[PDB]
From Swiss-Prot, chains A, B:
<feature type="topological domain" description="Extracellular">
    <location>
        <begin position="342"/>
        <end position="352"/>
    </location>
</feature>
<keyword id="KW-1133">Transmembrane helix</keyword>
<feature type="topological domain" description="Cytoplasmic">
    <location>
        <begin position="374"/>
        <end position="389"/>
    </location>
</feature>
<feature type="topological domain" description="Extracellular">
    <location>
        <begin position="91"/>
        <end position="92"/>
    </location>
</feature>
<dbReference type="GO" id="GO:0015116">
    <property type="term" value="F:sulfate transmembrane transporter activity"/>
</dbReference>
<feature type="topological domain" description="Extracellular">
    <location>
        <begin position="197"/>
        <end position="235"/>
    </location>
</feature>
<feature type="topological domain" description="Cytoplasmic">
    <location>
        <position position="175"/>
    </location>
</feature>
<feature type="transmembrane region" description="Helical">
    <location>
        <begin position="448"/>
        <end position="468"/>
    </location>
</feature>
<dbReference type="GO" id="GO:0016020">
    <property type="term" value="C:membrane"/>
</dbReference>
<dbReference type="GO" id="GO:0071320">
    <property type="term" value="P:cellular response to cAMP"/>
</dbReference>
<dbReference type="GO" id="GO:0015106">
    <property type="term" value="F:bicarbonate transmembrane transporter activity"/>
</dbReference>
<keyword id="KW-0472">Membrane</keyword>
<feature type="domain" description="STAS">
    <location>
        <begin position="503"/>
        <end position="698"/>
    </location>
</feature>
<keyword id="KW-1003">Cell membrane</keyword>
<protein>
    <recommendedName>
        <fullName>Chloride anion exchanger</fullName>
    </recommendedName>
</protein>
<dbReference type="Pfam" id="PF00916">
    <property type="entry name" value="Sulfate_transp"/>
</dbReference>
<comment type="function">
    <text>Mediates chloride-bicarbonate exchange with a chloride bicarbonate stoichiometry of 2:1 in the intestinal epithelia. Plays a role in the chloride and bicarbonate homeostasis during sperm epididymal maturation and capacitation.</text>
</comment>
Length: 703, 703
């Protein structure tokens, strides 16, 4: 049974009775001293962190990993070259550079990445942001045949990717890799759904084989839809039907692969065996002159010389570069986190940012585009049996083999099989659409975040949609605690349990005592509402009572000066039957005098202010004689709430009702001590430990 | 003394023992029914709210107000015409329209405003924002002698003010007048400081009588500084010296007016006598040909015909219109709130928005600009003795008299005495600069908001700086609770008081029990940090323990299948001296099997998992056998934190350690019931009332 026999504490007698350890809080000098205190072990640890490869390469086990690693590397390399060919078209650049986006960063990641399962490269939505940023750049560059336009587009892509990599490297160096926590789960869901719809709309111009002008940021998806639906009559029926059949069978075989896992190890690489089928069917049968199907151009073999990034493209695409870098880092961290949790190894987000930045910089310098890990490719690599990043090495080797020697294949490719392959990974993100119902029935509040994120992204394009969604998500925090369900507490069962005042039957509030609870932190957006709710719950504005008391005191002093009232130690003689009620109206610049606290030290009679006054003065009465604030859920006050709380406490103290604050820990009172909260009026003895402690102290003091 | 004797409760037995009132929460149908249920009393109340004038005109007391009201009206009218002349110059439009901005809205406010002390009109910040919006509008309008430029500027000003009034009216209709609470006190202070610097820089082109191009939003103050400092040699020494002397005398007299209040009622109207002596000195002595001082042009008497607002200017300045409307409403509410608190009358924010919108619309339709209440003018009107809005009527009457009959005056005005008068009321706002020190020594977190607001406003111009600062402040809200000071609790004095684990000496944690406290709400930005801190405090990742236990069970089952181990009710025979340790490496797509909950029902021996296992299995031991989460400060969980909490609770329950949640009220458990938090695993019996209740229940269950 709950049995306690302790003295009543008030966090002041408690501090005296129980001494503290007196821990020294960390200053600013010692922090700098300890981070700047270089040591050989610290240097070795920081170097190993900056070069994670040396951490695990000597620890590689050469018996149970090589076969699985090489198989996964081959499979992920094939899927990576196919995905690069598909994704390079989203930027309206020649597909050759796609191989670079699937080759250069991954190699760099091998020597700087900390994860062990993801497969670095391009993923479709990042490619779409690259394309949007490029279309913005070329349309804004001041001017000083189509191959020239393609070359300037690829130059813009390289520049934008180099700047994105520079931004990622700068973020990683500054050790601000904790930014990824500002993106909620609901915002991520909404962004994934909107991105799914965006990629579905953007692949249409390849499924139908039409020509669309490169649209811009303000409203992109709807413009692409309009321009692609205005020219249905100019479609290619053969390309449409082949895209539909390959997409349908790819989805079917993906469903079979997901359904059958135990009986089917090393899942069927339908992508390779089907791109080869499409290539073989196109070859010989000539789906380039018998039909008018667009075909991937002749691949020019060999690498390309690096080009310095353009300063003008840096200047014109800064905000979109910030956006693309943040999206890339967030996607990579979210993809790697699941595998890290599954296999239980440490993950360094900041090192991930550094590796991504270096990979992006290297790839962009060599005419590629921004890269990360792709969920579909990473899932393929892991499920095939990927163990370490050596699978990434084998994938890069396969991509290099394709880009160097085996390049005249994939040349008769249908240029729509790639689009269907890219869009076939849309099952998860589109099926995620069934999240409005769950959130609405669950929380009714994160559903608002999801819907607003979806609408904002769809309207604004992913460059600005993410930022607007983040702003709205941050605003929803203030929205949640904008109107706290402030309540009045009361005793239950004549014990030390206190609950809401409209929830039970055998309740008993102590006489002249009202207990208030505000179950949310009080900051700039809450102090007004908290003050209004507290005043309404109490039943009277303390300032009004104080002003009325001051006016009554002034009237009494005036009557005493006129001699109509004689001051006695007990009461007054009141040598008047009835006065004419010559109430005075105080002008401006003098009403503030009524705000001052009342001190009747001159008058021997201690006026009760609650029974009655001579000559029938107003003097409104108050039954409440003590107030306890249940600050058990208050988590932080900064400035405005502190000023409001100080004003409220001064107002209550001045009308001669004590106020007690209950439930706060030592950290809260320590923090409040800095705000100059305490002074000659609001002492430090108003803080207590538990509501029952406060009420017991009140009862002891009163009688 | 603190005496209590009650049974141990767990918010489930407590619910059964103490029945609830069963209050019916308001639905969506009843809310609509009650707001749509029109009633004659409700209609009368809503009409009186929509026309607050009829509320107080019959209640006017024509014995003690009329003299003070008329005096205040005359004084505020003189100061209002002077201020309008000064402020209209900030928009680079002829000063005539300034009178309109000081006349039209105020009259409208008389029939729609609810405040009783403020004086409606233009204030220099709103004029500057109008000027910036106009300069943006004319520079962006597609094209289809100097007076034509002035006429198009005034047309743009009228259009932008009409749109701002429309926005204000729309906001007031929608009853969203609570937006004004999103602006903290620190943000307000920073904005006022930056705006003081802005007005000081923008009055320079009049302080010296030069010519400056109308700069734009991106960086305005610095551009004006450069273009005004490149032409110091083209100044007017007479204008400079006269502006300096009028500034000096007005500052000195303001100082003596603040210092001397009791001995000097109805404060000296220094502005009126100063401008009249400046005009008299200019007249006759001809400060227009003896010197080259720019003067106010010949006033064209009479009103002007209304012009329809321009659609092109409407669409070109939507965002700046939103910004100016919000700034105007916030300024008016902040100015009126102080007086409402001083005189204790009801104040309606939504009605204030409606009145401001109607006034702005009427003024803009009649060729004026945006209007609000100015702190200087309102303070003058109140301190002179203003009692109600009739003083506003008298001020509007004086302005009308000036604009109709006495208009040839103020023509020999010096066009810099007005600038000096406008800038002389800046001391009380520039003295806010000494707020960085107070905040830094006080809170160290709102000082960041103040500095960021100052920098953002200075760099970006007010219209964008306000929005950027609001976004940063909303981000700071998350910043405060991004890294909660998570702590471990322990008993104090062998009683029901629990405190931090590094703050006392005679502490006693119960055996195998760790109590965790997270003193901040857990949302998307906190669940990862909370989980990491909790796991670190406990000392082991539960998932690792569960996986190792599952691996050990699989190995034991394999040995039993091979027959090397014989299962007995107590222990095993273990018919092997030592095995070769043929540890198996589980491949991918099968590791998740180790994640499944443990269930050794088939084996009769209940494995303790803490003493020892045959054949020297790893099986890490855990001393902790019960965990209590002090959810006394948790205020809200939405989705992501709920998912993380469910995962953590499942992980802990599966490794056979009970988990209890303590301190939450009925509202929190009711809310958590919706998130599908409870199921067959995490029952509803894990919630308790107090930490001592939880530990007492643990002790009772254990022994
Ligand atoms: C609060 C929620 C609803 C988000 C706010 C939505 C606005 C930011 C969107 C909605 C409608 C959009 C407009 C809809 C149509 C157009 C026309 C469009 O012009 C073209 O047709 C350009 C063609 C070309 O040059 O290729 C330029 C963007 C614009 C003004 C859009 C700008 C962005 C707007 C205002
Ligand atoms: C979230 C809120 C804003 C509700 C969404 C409303 C939509 C139904 C509206 C808002 C913006 C509108 C679009 C604004 C601009 C365009 C582009 C316009 O096409 C062009 O300008 C032609 C391009 C060219 O040929 O250069 C066709 C109409 C369309 C898709 C509009 C279709 C209807 C849209 C999507
Ligand atoms: C976390 C921080 C450190 C990352 C910021 C990214 C910088 C590495 C980028 C972003 C803005 C870039 C600048 C944007 C604009 C210019 C002006 C440009 O000057 C010109 O020659 C202008 C050309 C013209 O306008 O005619 C020189 C490069 C520079 C400094 C850029 C250099 C690279 C900068 C600093
Ligand atoms: C995330 C935190 C830790 C750092 C964020 C820093 C950025 C918000 C700032 C830092 C420097 C800024 C840049 C400084 C200089 C320039 C060049 C500027 O271009 C010009 O100088 C144009 C001049 C002309 O047109 O005459 C465009 C803005 C930009 C890219 C700025 C963009 C915003 C930047 C990257
Ligand atoms: C991160 C915090 C601390 C500061 C916020 C950074 C940006 C929001 C600001 C800082 C520097 C600003 C830039 C500074 C200089 C210019 C040049 C300016 O162009 C001119 O001055 C053209 C006129 C002329 O120079 O003749 C256009 C705005 C711009 C790009 C500014 C845009 C807004 C920027 C990037
Ligand atoms: C704390 C940081 C983030 C912001 C403050 C930095 C300032 C010291 C810099 C940043 C942008 C600069 C401005 C960028 C552009 C211009 C416009 C330029 O206007 C002109 O007349 C240029 C044309 C010419 O004179 O040839 C004058 C300098 C100025 C105000 C610069 C002055 C110095 C500024 C304000
Ligand atoms: C729900 C509440 C918050 C409503 C708030 C009001 C504003 C959002 C409305 C009121 C007036 C509206 C404007 C009134 C007139 C027009 C002209 C209209 O026509 C054009 O400018 C296009 C034709 C052309 O090119 O001339 C475009 C929308 C716009 C700017 C409107 C945009 C939306 C505004 C600002
Ligand atoms: C704050 C909440 C309560 C309401 C938010 C509404 C605004 C953010 C939206 C609603 C309607 C929008 C307007 C709808 C239409 C247009 C016309 C658009 O111009 C064009 O379509 C130009 C097309 C061309 O030039 O061909 C410019 C933006 C604007 C004013 C939009 C600006 C953003 C507005 C005011
Ligand atoms: C394009 C894409 C694909 C297509 C493919 O990989 O083939 C996918 O499968 O998953 C995605 C996921 C899960 C995404 O969310 C990650 C995220 C985390 C934090 C902030 C933000 Br913003 C985004 C974003 C894009 C994709
Ligand atoms: C122009 C101006 C003058 C000049 C004069 O009247 O002579 C003044 O004296 O005070 C001001 C104050 C105190 C201002 O802050 C009010 C505010 C409240 C809430 C949000 C925001 Br954003 C702003 C804004 C402008 C002025």
């Amino acid at each position: 049974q709950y049995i306690v026999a302790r003295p009543v504490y008030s966090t002041n007698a408690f501090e005296e009775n129980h001494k503290k350890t007196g821990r020294h809080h960390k200053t600013f000098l010692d922090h700098l001293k300890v981070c700047c205190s270089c040591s050989p072990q610290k240097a070795k640890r920081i170097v190993l962190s900056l070069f994670p490869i040396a951490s695990w390469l000597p620890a590689y086990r050469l018996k149970e990993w090589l076969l699985s690693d090489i198989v996964s590397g081959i499979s992920t390399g094939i899927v990576a070259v196919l995905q690069g060919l598909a994704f390079a078209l989203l930027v309206d650049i020649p597909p050759v550079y796609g191989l670079y986006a699937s080759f250069f960063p991954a190699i760099i990641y091998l020597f700087f990445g900390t994860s062990r399962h993801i497969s670095v490269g391009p993923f479709p939505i990042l490619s779409m942001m690259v394309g949007l940023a490029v279309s913005g750049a070329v349309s804004k560059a001041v001017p000083d045949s189509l191959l020239d336009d393609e070359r300037v587009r690829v130059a813009a892509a390289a520049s934008v990717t180099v700047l994105s990599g520079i931004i990622q490297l700068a973020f990683g160096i500054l050790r601000i890799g904790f930014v990824v926590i500002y993106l909620s789960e609901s915002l991520i869901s909404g962004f994934t759904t909107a991105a799914a719809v965006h990629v579905l709309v953007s692949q249409l111009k390849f499924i139908f084989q039409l020509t669309v002008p490169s649209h811009t940021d303000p409203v992109s998806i709807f413009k692409v839809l309009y321009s692609v639906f205005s020219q249905i009559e100019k479609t290619n029926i053969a390309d449409l039907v082949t895209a539909l059949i390959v997409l349908l069978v790819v989805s079917i075989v993906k469903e079979i692969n997901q359904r059958f896992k135990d009986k089917l190890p090393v899942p069927i690489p339908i992508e390779f065996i089907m791109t080869v089928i499409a290539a073989g069917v196109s070859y010989g049968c000539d789906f380039k002159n018998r039909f008018k199907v667009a075909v991937v151009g002749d691949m020019n073999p060999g690498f390309q010389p690096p080009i310095t990034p353009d300063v003008e493209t840096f200047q014109n695409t800064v905000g979109d570069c910030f956006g693309i870098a943040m999206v890339a880092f967030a996607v990579a961290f979210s993809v790697a986190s699941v595998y890290s949790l599954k296999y239980d190894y440490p993950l360094d987000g900041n090192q991930e940012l550094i590796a991504l930045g270096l990979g992006n910089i290297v790839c962009g310098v060599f005419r590629g585009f921004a890269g990360s890990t792709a969920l579909s490719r990473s899932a393929v690599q892991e499920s095939t049996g990927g163990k370490t990043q050596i699978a990434g090495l084998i994938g890069a080797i396969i991509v290099l083999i394709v880009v160097l020697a085996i390049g005249f294949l994939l040349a008769p490719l249908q240029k729509s099989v790639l689009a269907a392959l890219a869009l076939g990974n849309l099952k998860g993100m589109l099926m995620q659409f069934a999240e409005i119902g769950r959130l609405w029935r669950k929380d009714k509040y994160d559903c608002l975040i999801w819907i607003m994120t979806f609408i904002f992204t769809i309207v604004l394009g992913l460059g600005l949609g993410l930022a607007a969604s983040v702003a709205f998500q941050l605003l929803t925090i203030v929205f949640r605690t904008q109107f706290p369900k402030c309540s009045t507490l009361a005793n239950i069962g004549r014990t030390n349990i206190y609950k809401n005042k409209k929830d039970y039957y055998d309740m008993y509030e102590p006489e002249g005592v009202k207990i208030f609870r505000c179950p949310s932190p009080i900051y700039f957006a809450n102090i007004g509402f908290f003050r209004r709710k507290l005043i309404d719950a109490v039943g009277f504005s303390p300032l009004r009572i104080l002003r009325k008391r001051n006016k009554a005191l002034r009237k009494i002093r005036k009557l005493q000066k006129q001699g109509l009232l004689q001051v006695t130690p007990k009461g007054f003689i009141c040598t008047v039957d009835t006065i004419k009620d010559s109430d005075e109206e105080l002008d401006n610049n003098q009403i503030e005098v009524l705000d001052q606290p009342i001190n009747t030290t001159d008058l021997p009679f201690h006026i009760d202010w609650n029974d009655d006054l001579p000559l029938n003065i107003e003097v409104p009465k108050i039954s409440l004689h003590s107030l306890i604030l249940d600050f058990s859920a208050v988590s932080f006050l900064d400035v405005s709430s502190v000023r409001g709380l100080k004003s409220i406490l001064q107002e209550f103290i001045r009308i001669k009702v004590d106020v007690y604050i209950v439930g706060t820990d030592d950290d809260f009172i320590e923090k409040l001590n800095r705000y100059e909260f305490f002074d000659g009026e609001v002492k430090s003895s108003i803080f207590f430990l538990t509501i029952h402690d406060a009420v017991l102290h009140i009862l002891m003091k009163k009688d």
